Design a protein around this nucleic acid. Structure first.
Ligand SMILES: C[S@@+](CC[C@H](N)C(=O)[O-])C[C@H]1O[C@@H](n2cnc3c(N)ncnc32)[C@H](O)[C@@H]1O
Ligand code: NA
Length: 376
DNA sequence: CCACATGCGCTGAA
DNA sequence: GTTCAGCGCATGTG
């Protein structure tokens, strides 16, 4: 009766998709398997392996000779020199493990019908809004489209991914992007998929974070007919509220910010349940100038900048949300954070960067809970 | 025009 | 090349 769910995570990061599936697997009678993944960012790969591996023992290794397209900052490729610096280190063993055990193909431009796994149950992905335009698609989405085009011609219909799931930022549905987004949906139709777009806020899925994200869930149209799957109305879901205080970790050795030079005001709560107050003459950057009340929800955690530096008011003073608390804020577990910390390879700021790039795990749990698979 | 809200950001000096 | 402190406006609603 157990159903093996083969998942392929494009732009996998630390694997919020895989985590959500593992979290619900027992309740669905599923066994989750790594079909493959695509992630080039060294710190994300290391962290993914730390979080998701079982019985991996890191050791000094030569980097596999075809691991050539990777990135230390997530944006730009590492040089020949930088590859040399990873070669013959413990870090190399993480990258080798991701390749061998998780079938990480690293770079989407290197994925094609000759290495894209057949019979995928769930394919996850994303793309920046620029990719909708010429510079017709471009960039990462063009590669995803190329891959779907390629496998459409070489695979049987039944070998194509059963479900696709895109995550993206809210601005995907802006005036400038919405029509071109709709043409991507038309293209998915041409590839044989029926889709539904959801705009979901983490705060409605048992989280203390305001975070609005766009999801496009697609089902292969013959599999829709076979299963009798119907899309659920997830935008109407409103679970009980959670407050920032519910995730905070007690410590006697936090660093508190000296805000004595800055004038401030009372807290005010907005319609989004964010409770905040401004610091006057602090910076000229509006999003940096707020302190958040722990009895409401907080702002969207970003990878960098002002919203990666979330100031909260506590009895003990004003401080930033810690890297551990940021993992919790994205609905990863304390043990996931400890595994990443224990690598001794990822800085505190890099741990927040990877958390800020992820997806709140319980949103994905709710989406994946709606999927239907046949007993055959 | 206004008030208000809100952000998986970006980058150049060291 | 890295790192992060310093820095503002795009894109809305009402
Ligand atoms: C917003 S994040 C995704 C985080 C992920 N959803 C998670 O569960 O943590 C986007 C990711 O795409 C990755 N990426 C960017 N360009 C890539 C490429 N050419 N190949 C593979 N991954 C890429 C980045 O390194 C980054 O980790
Ligand atoms: Na080396």
């Amino acid at each position: 009766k157990i159903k093996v769910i083969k998942v392929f995570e494009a732009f996998a990061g630390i694997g919020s998709q895989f985590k959500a599936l593992k979290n619900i697997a027992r309740s669905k009678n599923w066994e989750i398997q790594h079909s493959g993944m695509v992630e080039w960012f060294v710190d994300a790969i290391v962290s993914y392996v730390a979080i998701h591996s079982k019985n991996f023992n890191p050791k000094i290794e030569r980097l596999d000779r075809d691991i050539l397209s990777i990135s230390n900052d997530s944006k730009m490729p590492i040089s020949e020199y930088g590859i040399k610096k990873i070669n013959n280190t413990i870090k190399a063993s993480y990258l080798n493990y991701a390749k061998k055990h998780f079938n990480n193909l690293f770079d989407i431009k290197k994925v094609n019908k000759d290495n894209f796994p057949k019979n995928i149950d769930i394919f996850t992905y994303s793309f920046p809004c620029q990719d909708l335009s010429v510079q017709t698609r471009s960039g990462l989405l063009w590669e995803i489209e190329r891959i779907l085009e390629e496998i459409k011609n070489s695979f049987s219909k039944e070998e194509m991914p059963k479900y696709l799931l895109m995550e993206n930022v809210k601005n995907l549905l802006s005036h400038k992007n919405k029509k071109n987004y709709n043409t991507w949906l038309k293209q998915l139709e041409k590839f044989g998929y029926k889709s539904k777009t959801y705009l979901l806020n983490s705060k409605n899925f048992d989280n203390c974070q305001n975070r609005e994200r766009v999801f496009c869930l697609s089902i292969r149209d013959d599999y829709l007919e076979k299963t009798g799957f119907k899309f659920k109305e997830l935008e109407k879901v409103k679970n009980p509220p959670k407050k920032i205080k519910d995730i905070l970790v007690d410590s006697s050795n936090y660093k508190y910010l000296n805000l004595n030079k800055y004038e401030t005001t009372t807290f005010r709560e907005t319609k989004s349940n964010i409770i905040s107050r401004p610091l006057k003459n602090y910076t000229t950057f509006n999003s940096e100038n707020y302190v958040y009340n722990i009895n409401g929800i907080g702002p969207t955690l970003t990878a960098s900048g002002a919203n990666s530096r979330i100031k909260i008011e506590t009895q003990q003073g004003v401080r930033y949300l810690t890297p551990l608390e940021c993992f919790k804020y994205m609905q990863f577990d304390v043990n996931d954070f400890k595994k990443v910390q224990s690598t001794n390879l990822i800085s505190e700021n890099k741990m927040i960067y990877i958390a800020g790039n992820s997806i709140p795990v319980k949103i994905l749990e709710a989406i994946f809970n709606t999927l239907e698979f046949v007993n055959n």
